[PDB]
Amino acid sequence: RSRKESYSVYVYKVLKQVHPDTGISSKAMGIMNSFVNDIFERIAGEASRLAHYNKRSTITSREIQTAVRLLLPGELAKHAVSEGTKAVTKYTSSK
């Protein structure tokens, strides 16, 4: 059958978290999926270029953070770095 992966269930969970009583259309679902894919490619690309610029062969959380600081503008970037730091800290603690 060749299963094709997607970010559907995840953006659905997020939707239920922020708006428990709202729905989502299939078109908008695909749009959100393409959105997350695009940003993923952007941040990962910029992180890759960052690693290559400093003669490093490993993309750590630092490269990701700098990439987010370069891509996302202003307060969006601030909250992004905030959530990222919280997540990586909570992951570091809870083994």
Partner 1 sequence: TNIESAPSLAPMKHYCDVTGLPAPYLDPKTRLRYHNKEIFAMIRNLPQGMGEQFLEARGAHTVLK
Partner 2 sequence: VLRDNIQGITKPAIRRLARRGGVKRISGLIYEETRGVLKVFLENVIRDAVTYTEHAKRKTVTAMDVVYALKRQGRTLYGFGG
Partner 3 sequence: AKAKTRSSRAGLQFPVGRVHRLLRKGNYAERVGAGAPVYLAAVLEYLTAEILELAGNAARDNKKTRIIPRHLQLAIRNDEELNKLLGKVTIAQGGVLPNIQAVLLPK
Partner DNA sequence: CTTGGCGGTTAAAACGCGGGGGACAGCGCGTACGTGCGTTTAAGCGGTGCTAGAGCTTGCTACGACCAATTGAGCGGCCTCGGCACCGGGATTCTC
Partner DNA sequence: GAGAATCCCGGTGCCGAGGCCGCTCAATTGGTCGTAGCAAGCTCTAGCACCGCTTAAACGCACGTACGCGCTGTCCCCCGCGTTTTAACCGCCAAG
Which parts of this chain interact with partner 2 (CB under 8 A)? 27, 30-31, 34-35, 37-38, 46, 49-50, 53-54, 62-63, 66, 69-70
| Binding residues for partner 1 restricted to 52-81, rule: CB under 8 A | 60-62, 65, 78
Q: For residue 33, give both structure tokens.
A: 């999926």
Q: Shortest Cβ distance from residue 62 to partner 1 (Å)?
A: 6
Q: Shortest Cβ distance from residue 2 to partner 3 (Å)?
A: 16
Question: Which CB contacts under 8 angstroms, 24+ apart, belong to 30-37?
Answer: 32/7, 33/6, 33/7, 33/8, 36/7, 36/11, 37/7
17, 58, 92, 93: which one contacts DNA (CB under 7 A)?
58
Are 43 and 64 a contacting pair, CB within 8 Å? yes
Tell me how far apart the alpha carbons of residues 43 and 70 are, in angstroms, rounded to a whole number: 9
**What track of x and - describes contact with partner 1 for positions 13 through 52 (by CB under 8 A)?**
----------------------------------------
